[PDB]
C-alpha cells in the first residue's frame, strides 16, 4: 500500500484543466489573440486574472463594464475556443511538468486512478488521448454525467465509488476554489496545486497539502516511493517519457555504449524525452539522426539494446552545444584528458548562456558527471573551467557563482566499450540501404462495410490511413533492423559522488559519500591486475590480452592474482565485500575476448605503476601486513621491471634504484623490507 | 556446459558455405556463367565437386592440374549481386540452433574457406554475425582445407580444445579438416551424397539443419511461463503462424503467445484474418499494433503482423500452406461459413509438398472441437468427394481443444477512428518540422560521397516514421492472465512457453463454461439493466457483487456433485474469476452480454447449471433470476421480440434432461419472473 504522510492511499482522482494540463494559460493567450483580431485591443492580463474562478456570464458582464456593452465577448470566446482546439490538436496538449513522473509512481504503487473533470466526455477523452495519459486512468467522471457539479462533492464521490473506494482512501488533485471545495467535502486527501492565480487563505486552510507546482509534489511523493534496484541485462527501459532533456558531452565509446544506457534507464518510472550527444564524427551524427536511433551490441548474450529518443549534434556548432547546456538537466562529460583544455571553452560558454538564460529549464542547477579514467579528473576539469570562465566573463563573482551553483560529480566506470570503425559503419549503411531498396519494391486503401461509422468519417478514415501508410511503410523495416555502433561488456553499476538531488532516484547509479574507496579498488583490483597481466602477455609474446587468455598460464595467473588482491581489500574495505566479488568476475569476463584491447596501452609507464602507494606495491604491503599469500603479486612486480628493461629499453640499474626507494616508503618491518627485494630481484634475472 | 548425447560440449564451430547458407549451389552457377563469358569452356562438374569447402587459393591449384583470378572475380561479383537482390539463402533452423547454443553458454565461432570480406558480407546480411565470438577465414590460414589448421585456429581463439567443440560441415574436404582437428564432427547433406568414408568420420549425421535442431532441442531446456512485461525474443526463425479471426482473443491474447513462442526464436511473420477493413488497413499502415494492459498501464507492441481479408481466397490459402501453427478464434455463429475456407486451405496443403499443422480451437462452448470437426468433415467431403483423402487430413494434423481464462475487449470502430484522427494531426505537424557528410575521417572522398546518398534517402524514408518510437496503435484492452491450457498431442506445444498442456481438457472446459462464462454473462445482464457500461465499475455495486457471489455458490454446489474430483479446486477457480472481474474497467458489459439466446441454450452456461441443481434438489433461485435477466436483456436492449423469446424459453426447457413436472414448474417460474422485471 502507498503511505502518504501516515495515511494509507488506494486511489488517486485528478482534475484535468489547471491541475494536469496548462490549458488555463493557453485560454489566456487565445482570448488575448482573439480580442486583437475582432475589437482591435487585447483584453488586459489583469482582466483575465480577475475572470479566474468566475462564470462565463460574470466574465462577460465584466468585459462589458470595461470594453463597452456591445463588446463581442461570445464571438471572442468562440474564436478563442477554436484557436485552443487547433493549437492542441497539432502541437499537443500542454502537460504540467512532472505529471507523467507522478502518474507512473502512483500507478506502480498499485493505485486505482480516475479523472474528475467539469469538461464534457468527448473533449475530455481526446485531451487525455492527445497527451498519452489516458492509459493511467481506470474511469473518467465528467460534468455532463452528474446532476450537481463543483463545488458539490457528487463528481469526486462518484469517481471514488466507481474505483470501489471510500473518498478518504483517495488522493484528490485540484487547482480551482470550487474544485477543492468539492474534493474536501467528499472527505478525500486534498492536494491543492497553484496554476496561475495565488490561492486565497480560505483555500489554503481547506487543503490537506499545498504545492507551488506539480514538481514540488513529485519531490514530496519521492519520499514515499522507493528507488528501484540496479537494472539487470536485457531489462526494458521505461515506456513513459518525462519532459526533461539530458546531455552526453562526447558521444564516444563510454558515452554512447554505457552512459546512454544509464540515462535511458533513469529512475525506472520515466526517462528523458530527448538525449543530446556531441561528436565531430559527421558519419556517426548523420547516420543516427537518419534512423532516429542506434543500438549497443552485448556480445556475450548476442543482445542488441536499442537507444531511442537520441539527437546527435556537432561539437564545433556553437548554437547546438549552448542548446545542450541550456535545455539539459544532467550532462555527462565523456572526453579524453587531452581534450579538457580545448572543450572547457565550450563548457564555459554553455554555463554562462545558462546563467543569462530566462528559461525554466535553466533556473534549476545542472548535475555534471565527470566520466574520465584519471585520478583528480574533477580537479583538472574545475581548474580549466575556472580559467575559461574568467577569459569569457571577465568577472570573478559571476565565475565563482557558476562553479558553486552546479553539482560536479566524480565517477568510477568499470564497463569496457569499443566504438565501431567508420569503414565498418559504411559497410552496415550499404547493406541496410540495400534492404530498404528491397523493401521499397513490394510497397508498389479501401475502407468498405457499414461498421458503425457515417460516410463522411468513413471517407475521412481512408485519407488518414493512406497518408499514414505512405509515410510509415518505408520505415516498417526498422521493426527488426538495428544500427550497431558500439560493442560493450555486461558491467552495469556506475559509482558517483553523493550530492545532486537528481541522482537520488537513478537506479543504475551507486551513490558514495567519498569516491576514494571505490577508486582504490578500481586502481588495485581492476587496473593493477590489467597492467600485471598485460606485462605477462607481452613477455609471453601476445599482441592483445584477449588472445593471451587462450594460454593456460596467463588465464591461471589472472585468476590467482585477482584472488590475492581482493582477499587483502576484504580486510582494508570490508564494506565493499560484495563490490569486490562482482568486479572480480566482471574483469575476467571482459578480458576473455578483449582482441580490440592492445597490451601496449595497458602496459604504458610501468615504473609509475610500480610506485609504493600504487596498483602493485600497495597490494603487496597490505597482504604482507595481514599475513596473506603475495606470490602472484611479487611475480607481477617482477614482470613490470622485466617489461620496462626489455620493451621500453630501461636500464637494470634504474629499475633497482626505483624498486629500493618504493620498499623503504612501505609501512613494513626492516626485516620484511629486505626479504621482499631479495626475492624480487631474483625473479627479474630469470625473465 | 551442454551434454549432447553424453558428451560435454563447451564450444560450437560452424562452416558457412553449404552448412549455414545455400551459397555452394549459387557459386556453382556463377563460376560456370563466368567461364562462358571469359575462357569460353564452362568448368566441368568433377572440378567444382572437388572445390566444395576448398580455399580460393587452393581451388586455383586444382585448376592448374586440369588446365582463375579473373574467373572467380566476376563469379564472386555475380554471387554478392544475387545476395543484394534475393538476400542470403539461410538454411532452415540455423537461427533457432545458434540462439539455443548461445543461451546454453557455448563459445561459438565460424571456420569458412571463403575470404573475410565475403564471409562478413553474408554474416552481416543474414544477421547471424552477433552469435559468433571469433571467425576464421581462408585469408589468415597458411594451409587451408582439408588441413585441420583452420578448425584448430578457430578452437584456439575460442580458448578451448577442439574435442570440447562441435564442428558443422557440408563438404568432404571440411569434414576431414574438422575430423583431423579431433572435434565432435557433424555432417549436413547439401550437394554431395555422403560417401561410406564420410559417414565413418562424422560422429552425428542429419539430412538437413532442421533435423539437428530437433535432436538438439531434447537436451536444450524449455523456458517457463513468461512474466507480464517480459520482452519477446529478438532473433526470428523462418516459420510462419496464422490467426483465423483477428478478434479480442486472436489479436489481444494469441498474438502474445505466438510472439513469445519458445523464448529462443519468434515466427518471421504472423498472418491474421478479419472482415473489419479499418482494423486490417490500420495495422498494415502502422506495421505494428499494441495490446493495452490497463492494470499496469503497459502497451505491448506486436510486430511482424500481416492482416488479410477472410473472403480473399489466395491470402487464406497462403496462411494454411506456410503456417506451422494456426489458431481458430471465431464465434460459434461463423463456424459453418468459415469451415469451407479451412477445408480449401488444408486440401491446398495436402496437394503441395509441408509439416503436420497444429490447429488450436479457441471457443467458449462445451464440445467445441466436435462442432468444428463435424463442420470441417462435411465441408471437405463436399469439395474433395473422397472419404479416404479427408480422413487422412483429419488424422494428419493436431486439432487441439483449449481453455482461455483471459478477459479481453476489441476497440470500437468509433474509438479506432478517434485514435487515427488525433494521431494524423501529429503526423501532419511533423511533416512541417522535417522541412552532406564532410571531413575525410579514415575514408576516401568516393566512399564519403556514396555514404551521403545512402543516409539522405534513408532519412527521407525513415524521418516521417520517427514519431512511431512513442506513437503506438492501441486496438485491445486486456487483463494480465498469461497461461493458455491446451490438449496434449502436438510436439510443438511442449516447447511454447505461454502454453500449459493438460490431460482432461473436457472437465476444466465444463467448469470454465458454468463457473466463469455463466456467472460472467449473468452479472453482465444484471449490470447492463442497472445502467453500467463497464464490468469493473459494475462490481463496485454491492448488489451486483453479492449476485455474482450468490450465483458462484449455486453453480459450485452443482459442479461438486457432477465433478467430485474437481470439488477441491472450485473455491480457488471461483475466486480467480472475481479477481479478473473486480478490476476489468475497460471490459464493456455489452461484450460479455452479447448473444443472450445462444448462452440460454439447454446445453450452455445458464440452463445446464439450473437443470443440475433441480435434479439434486439444490438452490437455483439466483440462477433462475440470471436466466430471466438474459431474456429481459434480449427483449429490452437487443430488441428480439417477446414472441421469439418465449418460443426459445419453451424450446430449450423441452430439451433439458428433466421430468415433465419439473419442465412445467421451471417454465412457469421463469416466465413469471420475466414479466415481474417488465412490471
Ligand atoms: O465470448 P462469449 O460471448 O461466448 O462470452 C463472453 C465472455 O464470457 C467471454 O468472452 C470471457 O470474457 C472469456 O471466456 C474469458 O473469460
Ligand atoms: Cl515530467
Ligand atoms: Mg481546474
Ligand atoms: Mg526528482
Ligand atoms: Mg563447405
PDB file of N, CA and C in Angstrom, chain A residues 103-140:
ATOM      1  N   UNK A 103       2.266  10.214 -12.181  1.00  0.00           N
ATOM      2  CA  UNK A 103       1.248   9.198 -12.578  1.00  0.00           C
ATOM      3  C   UNK A 103       1.873   7.797 -12.554  1.00  0.00           C
ATOM      4  N   UNK A 104       3.083   7.643 -13.104  1.00  0.00           N
ATOM      5  CA  UNK A 104       3.817   6.348 -13.157  1.00  0.00           C
ATOM      6  C   UNK A 104       4.106   5.861 -11.731  1.00  0.00           C
ATOM      7  N   UNK A 105       4.538   6.764 -10.843  1.00  0.00           N
ATOM      8  CA  UNK A 105       4.830   6.463  -9.414  1.00  0.00           C
ATOM      9  C   UNK A 105       3.557   5.956  -8.725  1.00  0.00           C
ATOM     10  N   UNK A 106       2.428   6.639  -8.929  1.00  0.00           N
ATOM     11  CA  UNK A 106       1.118   6.283  -8.317  1.00  0.00           C
ATOM     12  C   UNK A 106       0.628   4.950  -8.897  1.00  0.00           C
ATOM     13  N   UNK A 107       0.830   4.729 -10.200  1.00  0.00           N
ATOM     14  CA  UNK A 107       0.353   3.514 -10.914  1.00  0.00           C
ATOM     15  C   UNK A 107       1.176   2.301 -10.468  1.00  0.00           C
ATOM     16  N   UNK A 108       2.502   2.448 -10.382  1.00  0.00           N
ATOM     17  CA  UNK A 108       3.439   1.368  -9.969  1.00  0.00           C
ATOM     18  C   UNK A 108       3.330   1.116  -8.458  1.00  0.00           C
ATOM     19  N   UNK A 109       2.615   1.981  -7.726  1.00  0.00           N
ATOM     20  CA  UNK A 109       2.258   1.811  -6.292  1.00  0.00           C
ATOM     21  C   UNK A 109       0.917   1.075  -6.154  1.00  0.00           C
ATOM     22  N   UNK A 110       0.292   0.705  -7.279  1.00  0.00           N
ATOM     23  CA  UNK A 110      -0.934  -0.115  -7.331  1.00  0.00           C
ATOM     24  C   UNK A 110      -2.200   0.691  -7.085  1.00  0.00           C
ATOM     25  N   UNK A 111      -2.156   2.017  -7.263  1.00  0.00           N
ATOM     26  CA  UNK A 111      -3.330   2.909  -7.061  1.00  0.00           C
ATOM     27  C   UNK A 111      -4.286   2.775  -8.251  1.00  0.00           C
ATOM     28  N   UNK A 112      -5.588   2.669  -7.970  1.00  0.00           N
ATOM     29  CA  UNK A 112      -6.676   2.773  -8.977  1.00  0.00           C
ATOM     30  C   UNK A 112      -6.981   4.260  -9.176  1.00  0.00           C
ATOM     31  N   UNK A 113      -6.805   4.769 -10.398  1.00  0.00           N
ATOM     32  CA  UNK A 113      -6.773   6.225 -10.693  1.00  0.00           C
ATOM     33  C   UNK A 113      -7.958   6.616 -11.582  1.00  0.00           C
ATOM     34  N   UNK A 114      -8.454   7.847 -11.414  1.00  0.00           N
ATOM     35  CA  UNK A 114      -9.604   8.418 -12.154  1.00  0.00           C
ATOM     36  C   UNK A 114      -9.342   9.891 -12.490  1.00  0.00           C
ATOM     37  N   UNK A 115     -10.191  10.464 -13.346  1.00  0.00           N
ATOM     38  CA  UNK A 115     -10.209  11.918 -13.692  1.00  0.00           C
ATOM     39  C   UNK A 115     -11.613  12.449 -13.392  1.00  0.00           C
ATOM     40  N   UNK A 116     -11.710  13.451 -12.515  1.00  0.00           N
ATOM     41  CA  UNK A 116     -12.948  14.198 -12.194  1.00  0.00           C
ATOM     42  C   UNK A 116     -12.855  15.591 -12.829  1.00  0.00           C
ATOM     43  N   UNK A 117     -13.442  15.757 -14.019  1.00  0.00           N
ATOM     44  CA  UNK A 117     -13.347  16.983 -14.856  1.00  0.00           C
ATOM     45  C   UNK A 117     -14.738  17.604 -15.025  1.00  0.00           C
ATOM     46  N   UNK A 118     -14.803  18.938 -15.057  1.00  0.00           N
ATOM     47  CA  UNK A 118     -16.026  19.734 -15.338  1.00  0.00           C
ATOM     48  C   UNK A 118     -16.353  19.662 -16.834  1.00  0.00           C
ATOM     49  N   UNK A 119     -15.345  19.367 -17.665  1.00  0.00           N
ATOM     50  CA  UNK A 119     -15.432  19.270 -19.147  1.00  0.00           C
ATOM     51  C   UNK A 119     -16.391  18.148 -19.564  1.00  0.00           C
ATOM     52  N   UNK A 120     -16.725  18.098 -20.856  1.00  0.00           N
ATOM     53  CA  UNK A 120     -17.643  17.096 -21.461  1.00  0.00           C
ATOM     54  C   UNK A 120     -16.844  15.832 -21.799  1.00  0.00           C
ATOM     55  N   UNK A 121     -17.517  14.677 -21.844  1.00  0.00           N
ATOM     56  CA  UNK A 121     -16.909  13.335 -22.069  1.00  0.00           C
ATOM     57  C   UNK A 121     -16.027  13.360 -23.325  1.00  0.00           C
ATOM     58  N   UNK A 122     -16.558  13.868 -24.442  1.00  0.00           N
ATOM     59  CA  UNK A 122     -15.920  13.859 -25.781  1.00  0.00           C
ATOM     60  C   UNK A 122     -14.573  14.592 -25.733  1.00  0.00           C
ATOM     61  N   UNK A 123     -14.585  15.879 -25.368  1.00  0.00           N
ATOM     62  CA  UNK A 123     -13.379  16.763 -25.352  1.00  0.00           C
ATOM     63  C   UNK A 123     -12.383  16.243 -24.307  1.00  0.00           C
ATOM     64  N   UNK A 124     -12.879  15.730 -23.174  1.00  0.00           N
ATOM     65  CA  UNK A 124     -12.073  15.201 -22.046  1.00  0.00           C
ATOM     66  C   UNK A 124     -11.234  14.005 -22.514  1.00  0.00           C
ATOM     67  N   UNK A 125     -11.870  13.034 -23.180  1.00  0.00           N
ATOM     68  CA  UNK A 125     -11.226  11.783 -23.667  1.00  0.00           C
ATOM     69  C   UNK A 125     -10.153  12.115 -24.713  1.00  0.00           C
ATOM     70  N   UNK A 126     -10.425  13.068 -25.613  1.00  0.00           N
ATOM     71  CA  UNK A 126      -9.486  13.491 -26.689  1.00  0.00           C
ATOM     72  C   UNK A 126      -8.219  14.090 -26.064  1.00  0.00           C
ATOM     73  N   UNK A 127      -8.379  14.961 -25.062  1.00  0.00           N
ATOM     74  CA  UNK A 127      -7.275  15.659 -24.345  1.00  0.00           C
ATOM     75  C   UNK A 127      -6.349  14.626 -23.690  1.00  0.00           C
ATOM     76  N   UNK A 128      -6.929  13.633 -23.008  1.00  0.00           N
ATOM     77  CA  UNK A 128      -6.188  12.557 -22.291  1.00  0.00           C
ATOM     78  C   UNK A 128      -5.487  11.645 -23.308  1.00  0.00           C
ATOM     79  N   UNK A 129      -6.156  11.326 -24.422  1.00  0.00           N
ATOM     80  CA  UNK A 129      -5.594  10.521 -25.550  1.00  0.00           C
ATOM     81  C   UNK A 129      -4.467  11.321 -26.218  1.00  0.00           C
ATOM     82  N   UNK A 130      -4.684  12.622 -26.434  1.00  0.00           N
ATOM     83  CA  UNK A 130      -3.704  13.561 -27.048  1.00  0.00           C
ATOM     84  C   UNK A 130      -2.394  13.523 -26.252  1.00  0.00           C
ATOM     85  N   UNK A 131      -2.474  13.703 -24.929  1.00  0.00           N
ATOM     86  CA  UNK A 131      -1.319  13.811 -24.003  1.00  0.00           C
ATOM     87  C   UNK A 131      -0.697  12.431 -23.739  1.00  0.00           C
ATOM     88  N   UNK A 132      -1.405  11.350 -24.088  1.00  0.00           N
ATOM     89  CA  UNK A 132      -0.967   9.940 -23.891  1.00  0.00           C
ATOM     90  C   UNK A 132      -0.866   9.665 -22.384  1.00  0.00           C
ATOM     91  N   UNK A 133      -1.891  10.071 -21.626  1.00  0.00           N
ATOM     92  CA  UNK A 133      -2.011   9.837 -20.154  1.00  0.00           C
ATOM     93  C   UNK A 133      -3.321   9.094 -19.848  1.00  0.00           C
ATOM     94  N   UNK A 134      -4.131   8.788 -20.868  1.00  0.00           N
ATOM     95  CA  UNK A 134      -5.434   8.079 -20.742  1.00  0.00           C
ATOM     96  C   UNK A 134      -5.194   6.680 -20.159  1.00  0.00           C
ATOM     97  N   UNK A 135      -4.120   6.023 -20.612  1.00  0.00           N
ATOM     98  CA  UNK A 135      -3.657   4.674 -20.178  1.00  0.00           C
ATOM     99  C   UNK A 135      -3.618   4.559 -18.647  1.00  0.00           C
ATOM    100  N   UNK A 136      -3.315   5.655 -17.942  1.00  0.00           N
ATOM    101  CA  UNK A 136      -3.058   5.684 -16.477  1.00  0.00           C
ATOM    102  C   UNK A 136      -4.362   5.609 -15.672  1.00  0.00           C
ATOM    103  N   UNK A 137      -5.515   5.878 -16.293  1.00  0.00           N
ATOM    104  CA  UNK A 137      -6.813   6.069 -15.592  1.00  0.00           C
ATOM    105  C   UNK A 137      -7.753   4.894 -15.879  1.00  0.00           C
ATOM    106  N   UNK A 138      -8.459   4.449 -14.835  1.00  0.00           N
ATOM    107  CA  UNK A 138      -9.401   3.300 -14.853  1.00  0.00           C
ATOM    108  C   UNK A 138     -10.790   3.792 -15.275  1.00  0.00           C
ATOM    109  N   UNK A 139     -11.216   4.949 -14.756  1.00  0.00           N
ATOM    110  CA  UNK A 139     -12.529   5.589 -15.066  1.00  0.00           C
ATOM    111  C   UNK A 139     -12.323   7.099 -15.222  1.00  0.00           C
ATOM    112  N   UNK A 140     -13.159   7.740 -16.043  1.00  0.00           N
ATOM    113  CA  UNK A 140     -13.246   9.224 -16.187  1.00  0.00           C
ATOM    114  C   UNK A 140     -14.674   9.639 -15.819  1.00  0.00           C
TER     115      UNK A 140
END
